[PDB]
């Protein structure tokens, strides 16, 4: 129930008063209710609401989420959020302004990492993912995001110099793998791994999945995927592979390095099959009406596909994490997260026999 600093309170009041219709337009500053949802140095969240004793005038919301950035991609993220809201595939957009936005408040909690493996959950994550992999979005259709971003991080990574000895020591270990050659070896493997270019979330982890309040007894319609800011047209294998990788990481751990990694929490073949059996009919529409041997061939190939791209999830977020150790001031063990992603990378390679 934490209060923002009184200058933020005033700015939030004005945005709510001017952007929101109905009882909000005539609210005084002293009637305004706000509490921090999440702090941090950027992308801060607040809940704003009317007094309980204030009646609504029409269909205006009683309660909204304020998102403050704390600063091209700005236009792309804004248009995407607007489109998704229009398609009921995300929170409504109530206000956009240079410092942030006002969004629909969705009563909910995020999933915990252990919940990702629950069959009803997985099935539904697979369906939602298939669904927006299917949609049209006014963005560049060339799949350059994946390797373009890896190349960009690699370049930054090679330029990095740390001063603190345990960071320099850890950086020496990661560099000793020859990351540029590893990149090329990975590129070449993925060039021979067919994967359809689709519109990808790119960050489908539990923290970005909402368990809808009141819908816990719905078997197949209780979730919403959020936080599409890293979306792009990309290889389907990445979006799915990346999601499977996230089974292994728990970001709620309270001691340094502030995550737990468990190589044994990666989904089993049966768990993967259950995920892709739910994905496939939702994305192909009459997939169930194929011969069993053809369904099977598609499924076995898609498993190879997402498991090879899972390797790009490790390599890419490994590199990202090294970069974060340099530029971020967040309390998170970035170097240790990097080493965990590379460990998983080579363990995955050995498993696949590549």
Ligand X SMILES: Nc1nc[n+](Cc2ccccc2)c2[nH]cnc12
Binding-site residues for phosphocholine, please?
Answer: 40-42
User: Which stretch in 100-108, 150-158, 169-177, 186-194 sits in contact with ligand X by CB under 6 A?
Assistant: 100-108
Residues in region 182-211 near ligand U85 by CB under 6 A: 202-203, 205, 207
Cβ closest to ligand X, residue 103 vs residue 182: 103
316 contacts ligand X (rule: CB under 6 A): no
What is the Cα–Cα distance from 154 to 319, expressed in whole angstroms?
A: 6
CA 148/CA 202 separation, integer angstroms: 14
The entry of its own copies, ligand U85, ligand X, none near residue 332 (CB within 5 to 8 angstroms by kind) is ligand U85
Candidate residues 66, 190, 209, 210; the one interacting with ligand X per rule CB under 6 A: 210
Q: How far is the CB of 21 from its own copies (least distance, A)?
A: 7
Cβ of residue 18: shortest distance to ligand X, in angstroms?
20
- The nearest distance, CB 10 to ligand U85, in angstroms, is 23
| DSSP conformational letter for 18 | H
Q: Within 13 Å and on the Cβ side, how many CA atoms surround 145?
A: 21
The beta strands (E) that lie in 121-204 are given as 197-200
Closest to ligand U85 by CB, 40 or 148: 40
Does 40 help bind ligand U85 (rule: CB under 6 A)? Answer: yes
User: Structure tokens of 307?
Assistant: 């498991």
Per residue, the 3-state secondary structure of 43-75, as one string, reads CEEEEEECCCCCCCCCCCCCEEEEEECCCCHHH
Question: Torsion-angle region of residue 118: left (phi > 0), alpha (psi -120 to 50) or beta?
Answer: beta
Does 233 bind ligand U85 (CB under 6 A)? Our answer is: no
> Residue 296 CB: number of other CB atoms within 10 A?
11
Tell me how far apart the alpha carbons of residues 70 and 291 are, in angstroms, rounded to a whole number: 54
Verify binding: residue 36, ligand X, rule CB under 6 A: no
Contact 98, 15 (CB under 8 A): no
- In the numeric block, which tokens belong to residue 206? 């539990």
Q: Is residue 83 a contact residue for its own copies (CB under 8 A)?
A: yes
Q: Which residues contact 197 (CB under 8 A, 6 or more apart)?
A: 141, 142, 143, 233, 234, 235, 236
> Minimum distance between the CB of residue 61 and ligand X, rounded to whole angstroms?
11
What the block records as the tokens of 352 is 């696949």
Asked if 259 and 251 touch (Cβ cutoff 8 Å), the reply is yes
Among residue numbers 10 through 29, which ones bind its own copies (CB under 8 A)?
18-21, 25
Say how many Å lie between the first and final Cα of the chain, rounded: 51
Can you say how many angstroms the Cα of residue 55 is from the centroid of all Cα atoms in its chain?
Answer: 37
Q: Of these, 8, 43, 49, 108, which contacts ligand X (CB under 6 A)?
A: 108
Distance separating alpha carbons of residues 67 and 65, to the nearest angstrom: 6
Known binding-site residues for ATP equal: 38-44, 67, 104-110, 205, 227
Per the annotation, binding residues are 38-44, 67, 104-110, 205, 227
Of 141 and 155, which has the nearer Cβ to its own copies?
141
Contact between 330 and ligand U85 (CB under 6 A)?
yes
**Integer angstrom CA distances of residue 72 from 138, 148, 198:** 14, 17, 21
Per rule CB under 8 A, is residue 135 in the interface with its own copies? no
89 is a site residue for its own copies (CB under 8 A): no
Count of positions (residues) in the chain: 354
Candidate list 106, 261, 273, 290; residue touching ligand X; CB under 6 A: 106
Give the residue nearest to ligand X (CB): 106
Stretches 25-33, 101-109, 154-162, 325-333: which one binds ligand U85 (CB under 6 A)?
Answer: 325-333
- 238 close to 147: Cβ distance less than 8 angstroms: no
Rounded least distance, CB 87 to ligand X, Å: 15
Contact call for residues 122 and 275 (beta carbons, < 8 A): yes
- Which of 12, 16, 50, 65 binds ligand X (CB under 6 A)? It is 65
Residues that bind ligand X (CB under 6 A): 37, 65, 91, 103-106, 108, 210, 226-227
- Interface residues with its own copies (CB under 8 A)? 18-21, 25, 72, 74-76, 78-79, 82-83, 86-87, 93-98, 101-102, 136, 138-142
């Amino acid at each position: 129930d934490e209060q923002p600093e009184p200058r933020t309170r005033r700015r939030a009041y004005l945005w709510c008063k001017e952007f929101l219709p109905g009882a909000w337009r005539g609210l005084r500053e002293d009637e305004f209710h706000i509490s921090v949802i999440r702090g941090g140095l950027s992308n801060m969240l607040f809940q704003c609401s009317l007094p309980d004793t204030t009646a609504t005038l029409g269909d205006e919301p009683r309660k909204v989420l304020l998102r403050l950035y704390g600063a091209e991609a700005m236009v792309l993220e804004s248009v995407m959020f607007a489109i998704l809201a229009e398609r009921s595939l995300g929170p409504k957009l109530y206000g956009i302004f240079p410092q942030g936005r006002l969004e629909q408040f969705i009563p909910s909690r995020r999933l915990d990492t252990e919940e990702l493996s629950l069959p009803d959950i997985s099935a539904e994550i697979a369906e939602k993912m298939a669904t927006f992999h299917g949609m049209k979005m006014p963005f560049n259709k060339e799949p350059k995001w994946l390797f373009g971003t890896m190349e960009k991080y690699l370049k930054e990574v090679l330029r990095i110099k740390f001063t603190e000895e345990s960071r320099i020591k850890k950086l020496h270990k990661l560099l000793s793998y020859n990351l540029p050659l590893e990149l090329e070896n990975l590129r070449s493997l993925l060039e021979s791994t067919p994967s359809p270019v689709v519109f990808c979330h790119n960050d489908c982890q539990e923290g970005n999945i909402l368990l809808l309040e009141g819908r816990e007894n719905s078997e197949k319609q209780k979730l919403m995927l959020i936080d599409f800011e890293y979306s792009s047209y990309n290889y389907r294998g990445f979006d799915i592979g990346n999601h499977f990788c996230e089974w292994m990481y728990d970001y709620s751990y309270e001691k340094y390095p502030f995550f737990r990694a468990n190589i044994r929490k990666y989904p089993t073949k049966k768990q993967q099959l259950h995920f892709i059996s739910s994905y496939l009919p939702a994305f192909q529409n009459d997939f169930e009406n194929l011969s069993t041997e053809e369904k099977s061939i598609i499924k076995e190939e898609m498993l190879l596909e997402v498991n090879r791209f899972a390797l790009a999830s490790h390599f890419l977020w490994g590199l990202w994490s090294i970069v974060q150790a340099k530029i971020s001031s967040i309390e998170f063990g970035y170097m240790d997260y990097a080493q965990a992603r590379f460990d998983a990378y080579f363990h995955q390679k050995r498993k696949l026999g590549v």
